[PDB]
Amino acid sequence: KNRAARVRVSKGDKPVTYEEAHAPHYIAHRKGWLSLHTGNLDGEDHAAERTVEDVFLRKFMWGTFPGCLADQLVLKRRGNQLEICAVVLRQLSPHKYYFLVGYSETLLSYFYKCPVRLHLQTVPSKVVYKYL
């Protein structure tokens, strides 16, 4: 019995999404990686820095868009430009949404001295994969 990135089977009143429902040994088999970079490949370097910076990015953005997200993020780093993709809910105002979008993008750019962009996809209620 191993407990690793999995949900305990309940009576069937727990909405669960794809990535957190599926096991961590289904990553390459029935999932995709949240981030995409080449530091893991051979010949590259700075992989530890990549991991630290993307963890801090995910934490900071989760906490500066709190209560609206309903799933993990998608990171897409093509050379220099960084791209973020999020799924959120539509309870707060587009005013606040755009304000925080610009705020976070400017902060990330000024911190990492890197061109950054981020996109968000609206959902009325978080999609559920199954009831476990």
Partner: peptide
Amino acid sequence: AKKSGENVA
């Protein structure tokens, strides 16, 4: 509002 966020930055 976006420009105001820029000014806040």
